[PDB]
Write a protein that binds this ligand. Structure first.
Ligand SMILES: *[C@@H]1O[C@H](CO)[C@@H](O)[C@H](O)[C@H]1NC(C)=O
Ligand SMILES: *[C@@H]1O[C@H](CO)[C@@H](O)[C@H](O)[C@H]1NC(C)=O
Ligand SMILES: *[C@@H]1O[C@H](CO)[C@@H](O)[C@H](O)[C@H]1NC(C)=O
Length: 148
């Protein structure tokens, strides 16, 4: 049973904003935001899937460590043939988020919520809404947003 070293430090800000500080006290954190606002639309070459979501971080510094950390975050999810949310990569050079994960479908939403509750603890279930819903994934600077 393999124990990855690339485990981030979780930091829940509130029901919609979450941070995963990079392993080994990195100066960055992966930012997750639950929102019903859609910022990315599918074009001919920005679509990804859970297995290669790492490619949505190719233009980032520390790309390898970012991939290992996203691999940790999606454990149990990318292994699931039925976890098939639409994922779109954003243009980070134009200020867009790294990835937009479509969680409008209830089964996908709830699978993500259950994983996030396991990592962060209890928060408001976002899946009881109807209408479009997303998780936006980006990279923020770590400024000690959580401490003891
Ligand atoms: C959650 O936190 C983010 C930034 O930390 C803020 O933009 C948002 O308004 C907060 N939400 C609530 C319900 O306080
Ligand atoms: C997300 O999925 C829903 C239904 O599956 C769809 O209506 C919506 O257009 C999708 N979002 C994007 C950005 O395509
Ligand atoms: C991820 O893989 C799919 C299918 O293999 C491919 O169509 C898509 O271009 C890949 N995404 C990126 C960002 O390379």
């Amino acid at each position: 049973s393999y124990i990855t070293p690339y485990v981030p430090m979780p930091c829940m800000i509130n029901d919609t904003h979450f941070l995963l500080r990079g392993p080994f006290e990195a100066s960055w954190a992966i930012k997750l935001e639950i929102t019903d606002v859609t910022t990315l639309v599918v074009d001919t070459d920005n679509v990804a899937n859970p297995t290669n979501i790492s490619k949505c971080f190719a233009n980032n510094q520390d790309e390898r460590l970012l991939g290992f950390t996203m691999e940790w975050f999606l454990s149990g999810l990318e292994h699931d043939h039925h976890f098939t949310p639409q994922i779109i990569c954003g243009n980070v050079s134009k200020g867009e988020v790294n990835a937009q994960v479509n969680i409008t479908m209830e089964d996908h939403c709830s699978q993500v919520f259950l994983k996030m509750r396991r990592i962060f603890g209890v928060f408001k279930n976002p899946c009881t809404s109807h209408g479009k819903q997303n998780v936006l994934i980006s990279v923020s600077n770590w400024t000690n947003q959580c401490s003891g």
